[PDB]
């Protein structure tokens, strides 16, 4: 995300699919991020980022 | 050190939501250290 945008959106969708599949694999156990509680709640926020990307693409498709 | 303290707390409990809270506190302390 930090280096550059745009064509990275479809890659971020694939990454959301990967994170969602990994969460389904590890259903009861928690895991913490450092550099903490970036479990299921922030994964729902990444889902919001995906919906924002979908809406932007649909608006972009209605322009031409 | 912190892990050992957690183990000691677990031993005290023996003789867990509270444990989870303690872990969260430890995480907060780590964040403070990072800051």
Resolution value, angstrom units: 5.5
Contacts of residue A36 in chain B, CB cutoff 8 Å?
A: 27, 30-31
| 8 Å CB contact of B30 and A37 | no
Tell me which residue of A38, A5, A2, A1 sits closest to A23, measured CA to CA.
Answer: A38
- Looking up tokens 């003789």, which residue turns up? B15
Which residues on chain A place their C-beta less than 8 Å from a C-beta of chain B?
Answer: 32, 34-37
Measure the CA angle with vertex A24, ends A32 and A10; round to 5°: 85
- Looking up tokens 């450092």, which residue turns up? A34
C-alpha B8/C-alpha A44 separation (Å) is 35
C-alpha B11/C-alpha B33 separation (Å) is 27
């Amino acid at each position: 995300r930090e280096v550059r945008t745009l064509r990275g959106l479809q890659k971020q969708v694939n990454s959301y699919l990967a994170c969602l599949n990994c969460l389904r694999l590890i259903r009861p156990e928690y895991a913490w991020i450092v550099q903490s509680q970036i479990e299921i709640l922030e994964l729902r926020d990444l889902e919001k980022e995906y919906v924002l990307a979908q809406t932007r693409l649909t608006l972009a498709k209605h322009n031409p | 050190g912190c892990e050992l303290e957690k183990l000691h707390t677990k031993v005290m409990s023996l003789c867990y939501t509270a444990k989870d809270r303690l872990a969260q506190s430890e995480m907060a302390k780590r964040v403070a250290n990072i800051l």
